[PDB]
Amino acid sequence: NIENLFVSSVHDTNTMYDRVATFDYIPRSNNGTSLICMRQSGTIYRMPISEVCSKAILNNRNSLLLSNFENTEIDEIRVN
């Protein structure tokens, strides 16, 4: 029952402003993520997480498939 954990991937994000002490998540719709952060001065702002594409494979019909690191929908570029 005990799950021996290990780290798979580390995703980095740069804050909008420096000198941040504490932060917290914001649950968004469709598995989105925004970050609320409190600076050392005490000013609180909002920072979003970019939808980074995770896989760009190419078809034999010259089509592009795009998976995201955040949510589950898959983007399609067609040759038409």
């Binding site: 402003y17 000198r19 600076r39 050392q40 001065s41 005490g42 000013t43 702002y45």
Partner: protein
């Protein structure tokens, strides 16, 4: 901190204020309505969240909104808020 009352900037009866936080890392422009004592009169309009270790601050009476901000490193960032 540094609170500086600025005149010759508002045509109406409201009075504008400029503030620097005690961490010396932020500059905030305020408009204060004097006829109402409640804290809703202290309105925060714009904020410029940069610099770091501010040491001085002034304003231009003739031209509206032009505000000079000093720094400890040596850069005098002169810009506009209004």
């Amino acid at each position: 901190g540094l609170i500086k009352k600025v005149t010759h900037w508002s045509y109406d009866n409201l009075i504008d204020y400029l503030s620097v936080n005690p961490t010396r890392d932020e500059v905030t422009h305020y408009k204060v309505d004097p006829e109402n004592e409640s804290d809703e009169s202290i309105i925060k309009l714009h904020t410029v969240k940069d610099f770091g270790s501010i040491t001085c601050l002034d304003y231009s009476e003739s031209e509206i909104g032009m505000i000079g901000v000093g720094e400890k490193n040596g850069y005098l960032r002169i810009f506009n808020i209004s």
